[PDB]
């Protein structure tokens, strides 16, 4: 797999708020064939949704309920893409 | 859709031991298009690995380092499959 050819980016790979959807995109168009694995690890369980869009992009959203530091990993054919894993601080509301 | 058509089973959905790979299988062949999501929650960080086999089955293994009770979630298209979440006792080695 051409994990090195995959790119991801967006606010959900930078900062998030507890209980609020954190969103980012993945572009695998130049990578060829492969499977994606998206992992979120930290103080509570993530709900993850994925949208295979018609426009050459893959939309990801996750929500976690507890504040704290989360690690977001994006792997293509089981290799970390560039910049993965991402450390994301999730703040407590207010 | 599809989650009600998925099945999972194996030793890792029943009981495990700290530091030993806990293994189970998922069969989503009858469920059609979709994303599988697996989660493990309890008193220590899980390392989760996944093998998409060419044989109609998906293999999963997790390892956790601390004994205690863990929950294992298997969802297909954002919905729990039958019997998920699973509660798994993890014993000392």
């Amino acid at each position: 797999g051409g994990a090195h050819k995959v790119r991801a980016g967006g606010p959900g790979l930078e900062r998030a708020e507890a209980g609020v959807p954190a969103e980012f995109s993945i572009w695998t168009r130049e990578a060829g064939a492969g499977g994606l694995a998206i992992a979120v690890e930290g103080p509570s369980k993530a709900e993850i949704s994925f949208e295979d869009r018609k426009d050459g992009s893959c939309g990801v959203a996750y929500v976690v309920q507890e504040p704290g530091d989360y690690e977001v990993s994006v792997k293509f054919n089981e290799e970390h893409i560039p910049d993965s894993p991402f450390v994301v601080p999730v703040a407590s509301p207010s | 859709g599809g989650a009600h058509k998925v099945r999972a089973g194996g030793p890792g959905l029943e009981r495990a031991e700290a530091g030993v790979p806990a293994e189970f299988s998922i069969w989503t062949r009858e469920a059609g298009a979709g994303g599988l999501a697996i989660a493990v929650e309890g008193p220590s960080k899980a390392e989760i690995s996944f093998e998409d086999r060419k044989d109609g089955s998906c293999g999963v293994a997790y390892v956790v380092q601390e004994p205690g009770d863990y929950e294992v979630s298997v969802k297909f298209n954002e919905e729990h499959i039958p019997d998920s979440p699973f509660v798994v006792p993890v014993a000392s080695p």
């Binding site: 994606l36 694995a37 690890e41 709900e47 295979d52 | 999501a37 008193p43 220590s44 996944f50």
Partner: peptide, 9 residues
Amino acid sequence: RVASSVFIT
């Protein structure tokens, strides 16, 4: 409780 949540597709 800590958690690892993985999505595969």
